[PDB]
Amino acid sequence: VNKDQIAKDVKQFYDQALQQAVMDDDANNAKAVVKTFHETLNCCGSNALTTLTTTILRNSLCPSGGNILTPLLQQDCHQKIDELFSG
């Protein structure tokens, strides 16, 4: 406890990392964090739009072997995080 607060903190942390990893070419730590989240949760964004942005600008941050269509079959990272904390 509190699981709700933990999940919220994790999502906020991911959001901040995602923003840095995409905006800055040299946000080394942020990119590492984001890549780990994405590989672990099989996602590539906080929502449908940011997922699309990431796939277009920094596709290497997405799970390996992805393309422009892949997000259609993926829950976003917020949804994946929620799942972990609502089981």
C-alpha angles and dihedrals in degrees: 000000000000095000092164091056093045091052090048091051092049093050091049090049091050092048092053091047092048092052091051096043092054101037099042122055091204104041089123099171093044092052091050092050093047094047090052093050092048095047092044097046099029095235139109110206149020091253143352095285099042088046089056091047092053094046089053102041104029109014092163087073090064123084110289118274096025133145141184094284098049098086090067089073096041132084111225122254093259090056091047091050091048089053092055090053099041098055 
